[PDB]
Write an enzyme that holds these catalytic residues in place. Structure first.
Site, PDB file in Angstrom:
ATOM      1  N   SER B 240       0.836  -1.206   0.000  1.00  0.00           N
ATOM      2  CA  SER B 240       0.000   0.000   0.000  1.00  0.00           C
ATOM      3  C   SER B 240       0.871   1.257   0.000  1.00  0.00           C
ATOM      4  CB  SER B 240      -1.072   0.008   1.120  1.00  0.00           C
ATOM      5  OG  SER B 240      -0.529  -0.059   2.426  1.00  0.00           O
ATOM      6  N   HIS B 270      -2.508  -8.631   1.953  1.00  0.00           N
ATOM      7  CA  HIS B 270      -2.169  -7.398   2.632  1.00  0.00           C
ATOM      8  C   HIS B 270      -3.232  -7.031   3.680  1.00  0.00           C
ATOM      9  CE1 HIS B 270      -0.009  -3.917   3.507  1.00  0.00           C
ATOM     10  NE2 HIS B 270      -0.152  -3.210   2.357  1.00  0.00           N
ATOM     11  N   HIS B 318       5.549 -12.910   8.875  1.00  0.00           N
ATOM     12  CA  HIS B 318       5.645 -11.633   8.175  1.00  0.00           C
ATOM     13  C   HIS B 318       6.879 -11.638   7.270  1.00  0.00           C
ATOM     14  CE1 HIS B 318       5.742  -7.144   7.761  1.00  0.00           C
ATOM     15  NE2 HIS B 318       4.463  -7.149   8.269  1.00  0.00           N
ATOM     16  N   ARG B 327       3.242  -3.700  17.762  1.00  0.00           N
ATOM     17  CA  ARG B 327       1.877  -3.311  17.452  1.00  0.00           C
ATOM     18  C   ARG B 327       0.907  -4.354  17.998  1.00  0.00           C
ATOM     19  NH1 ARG B 327       1.818  -2.085  11.112  1.00  0.00           N
ATOM     20  NH2 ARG B 327       2.420  -4.311  11.200  1.00  0.00           N
ATOM     21  N   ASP B 373      -2.463  -8.333  13.014  1.00  0.00           N
ATOM     22  CA  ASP B 373      -3.726  -8.863  12.518  1.00  0.00           C
ATOM     23  C   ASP B 373      -4.250  -9.986  13.420  1.00  0.00           C
ATOM     24  OD1 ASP B 373      -3.684  -7.124  10.157  1.00  0.00           O
ATOM     25  OD2 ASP B 373      -2.057  -8.441   9.437  1.00  0.00           O
TER      26      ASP B 373
HETATM   27  O1  LIG Z   1       4.992  -4.538   6.255  1.00  0.00           O
HETATM   28  C1  LIG Z   1       4.159  -5.286   5.662  1.00  0.00           C
HETATM   29  O2  LIG Z   1       4.393  -5.909   4.573  1.00  0.00           O
HETATM   30  C2  LIG Z   1       2.758  -5.386   6.268  1.00  0.00           C
HETATM   31  C3  LIG Z   1       2.207  -3.994   6.439  1.00  0.00           C
HETATM   32  O3  LIG Z   1       2.345  -3.163   5.554  1.00  0.00           O
HETATM   33  C4  LIG Z   1       1.651  -3.541   7.474  1.00  0.00           C
HETATM   34  O4  LIG Z   1       1.538  -4.285   8.435  1.00  0.00           O
HETATM   35  O5  LIG Z   1       1.278  -2.361   7.447  1.00  0.00           O
END
Ligand SMILES: O=C([O-])CC(=O)C(=O)O
Ligand SMILES: O=C([O-])CC(=O)C(=O)O
Lengths: 434, 434
Positions: B240, B270, B318, B327, B373
């Site tokens: 993103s 994502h 990840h 987080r 998540d």
């Molecule tokens: O870092 C990543 O690929 C996953 C990610 O963007 C996120 O958790 O915002």
């Protein structure tokens, strides 16, 4: 169809080649990253894999191994008309093969079944203010149709399977490709032609039907076919193709991916080069050369005034190409045949002669030669497409041929999510020793 | 404003550092590209420069140098409430500075002036079928607003100037950031809450006002603040952030860039990880463990059945992180305080204990630990946000803080168009020796 079976065959042949490279040759280095390249938008980094097209800095673009003169040479022509079925070029990009006149007709029939625009897409475009830029409307029309995504349905229904993922993605590709010209035409008419609409003709090929819906007579049909074929791909590193690739690598469907790509193509450094060329030619014929085709000489020294007072010549210079764009050359060949006496072409024609000697003296810009955008607009203009902002929508229809084919293969070969690593200026400063 | 002047000061300080790296250290190597990496979505390649945030594989994310517990520690809190002004975190990401209670209130006032949604955006969302995925609606609401782009106006009026380009881009950023929560809430209500709308309250901060418009009581306000702060950035390599960066590098405005980014965020790999976790926890509590919180033991061996029969644990693992996501940890801290006795949290809680030992035995996946998540959805669920598809829209509101700040800096520092080079499988096969 034959096309889906044929494409499944090619996929099964290609997967081993890819599996081997990864397992047996994954650690072979192929390039290196310098600081200038990380700060300067990855320029030059060999970081993407595509087989649809390859850009050699020198010879130009090859589609699946063929040069442009070869592609125009070998692709099946439309009866009555000088130019190939756009549908055939799509076959070629997907499969790697020049199709027979029989295989082109199957695709063309498949497009006819799928080219109808959803009513809700029209409703959406009307709800958006009419003074919205056409590329905004284009991208939103695509986006809205994500509701119909077969790929999305497939995934969301829990049927995702690494091996057969390309199959729904291919259906989305056939569907979206068949509708983009209708979408483009709707926008043209609603914005620029009093919002009266000519219906699609089921007896016409994609290019013929586009010209029809646009309301433009022959040979615009051929203009359209050529234009879409020329702009069909330019490997996967350009912003629009790279964006679709990138979005799709998260397993977003083609509607999301291609909508995102059009957001990229609307950038002034990508999709606006074509209008910004013509405007500047028209401003120049009007002011410096008195509303008349200059002699070779007033132009020759007019370039020097613009240059040595600190300004670009638009539609000369590219971030990979180092020679004349053969896409440019193919425009020139159409225009010699079909509009030798047009005033604006004659100024492009002369510029071809005079501008490369002069950008050569300065040894300044890494490409002292023309790209396509130098030649596209004058042809459109001559046939009455005088609405500059729309040129990018044409680009967008053409580029989908390559991009959508590339997205099918990305899923076919199971390429993973694109996730490079970022670094800070602080980190770059440590590595430089500061 | 103070913010724009302050940000101009930082830009003037930072441009020299950047100019130096380019002129004096442009050829310093920083990484190499292998075949594995070109085929595998540039994984691991240090190819992007961002100062907003840095993801260390081990410690986790830092926002402008601060850890999450530090950011929550130091940011000014909302009167009556446990969590910081989201506006303050935005200040921090733009400037690098923790703001005073007085500077946060100026931003908050600036957002209040700009948070009203254009009528035509509501008209657009109504024209789109009501059964459209909310992330499609979100992305199209943003896209529609491109009509108001100051950057676009600036460029199209011929006033583009390398030095002041960030200024309109910052105005677009303030405008779009101020409206995204309203946009998200409109979609929630129109789709999920009988299309009755609660008006925005001018006396409320961004987080408080979002909870208001969503129709959810305290402490959802704090849930929202935290969530948006946690999801605000994750360096510029994620799909993103990288998409917006890429689109914007062609000088597309933030409406185009952020619309394109949401096309990326909607991807299953994502933005859909959060719902796919909760669903799977709810499916598991219902089937294997009989609609009741398991004992530590039936869960402990339930993970082994799912694993050694060839399936992931969602929200563990990840593409960069190698440790616990902080987080994640900050979600856990909210949840211990506020919902210790919720059934679904208790299952997440136990999973934290039992799942890392077990993904460690297998030494298989390079991150045997949770990401965000794993913990997001259970908190939403507990407060009545039961509409899974919408979770990604929340992500999208949060992520804008980082991404829009990153786009301002990209223009500030004049970063060039992202145009890497593509290669064929034929070419990779030549370099392997075949
Ligand atoms: O870092 C990543 O690929 C996953 C990610 O963007 C996120 O958790 O915002
Ligand atoms: O930019 C590129 O690499 C090729 C292209 O599509 C363009 O000329 O717009």
């Amino acid at each position: 169809s034959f096309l889906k079976e044929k494409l499944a065959e090619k996929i099964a042949q290609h997967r081993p080649r890819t599996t081997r490279l990864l397992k047996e040759f994954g650690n072979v280095k192929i390039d290196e990253v310098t600081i200038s390249q990380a700060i300067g938008g990855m320029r030059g980094i060999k970081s993407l894999v595509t087989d649809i097209s390859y850009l050699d800095p020198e010879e130009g673009i090859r589609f699946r191994g063929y040069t442009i003169p070869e592609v125009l040479e070998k692709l099946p022509k439309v009866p009555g008309a000088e130019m190939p079925y756009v549908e055939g070029h799509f076959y070629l990009l997907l499969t790697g093969d020049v199709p027979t006149e029989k295989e082109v007709k199957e695709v063309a029939e498949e497009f006819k079944k799928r080219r109808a625009l959803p009513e809700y897409v029209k409703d959406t475009l009307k709800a958006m203010p009419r003074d919205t830029h056409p590329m905004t409307m284009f991208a939103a029309g695509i986006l809205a149709m994500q509701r119909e995504s077969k790929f999305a349905a497939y995934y969301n229904a829990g049927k995702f399977n690494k091996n057969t993922a390309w199959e729904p993605m291919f259906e989305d590709a056939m569907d979206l490709m068949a509708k983009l010209p209708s979408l483009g035409a709707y926008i043209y008419r609603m914005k620029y032609k009093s919002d009266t609409h000519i219906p699609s003709n089921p007896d016409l090929d994609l290019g013929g039907d586009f010209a029809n819906m646009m309301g433009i007579d022959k040979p615009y049909d051929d203009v359209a076919r050529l234009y879409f074929i020329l702009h069909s791909d330019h490997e996967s590193g350009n912003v629009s193709a790279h964006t679709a690739h990138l979005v799709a690598s998260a397993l977003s469907d083609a509607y999301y991916a291609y909508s995102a790509a059009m957001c990229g193509l609307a950038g002034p450094l990508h999709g606006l080069a074509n209008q910004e060329v013509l405007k500047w030619i028209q401003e120049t014929i009007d002011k410096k050369l008195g509303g008349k085709v200059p002699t070779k000489e007033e132009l020759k020294k007019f370039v020097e005034e613009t240059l040595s007072s600190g300004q670009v010549i638009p539609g000369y210079g590219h971030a990979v190409l180092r020679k004349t764009d053969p896409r440019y050359v193919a425009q020139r060949e159409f225009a010699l045949k079909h509009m030798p006496d047009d005033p604006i072409f004659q100024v492009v024609s002369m510029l071809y002669e005079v501008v490369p000697p002069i950008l050569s003296s300065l040894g300044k810009v890494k490409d002292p030669w023309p790209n396509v955008d130098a030649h596209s607009g004058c042809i459109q203009w001559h046939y009455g497409v005088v609405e500059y902002d729309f040129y990018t929508v044409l680009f967008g229809i053409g580029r989908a041929l390559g991009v959508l084919a590339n997205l099918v293969w990305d899923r076919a070969l199971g390429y993973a999510i694109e996730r490079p690593k970022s670094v800070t200026t602080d980190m770059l400063e440590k590595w430089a020793g500061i």
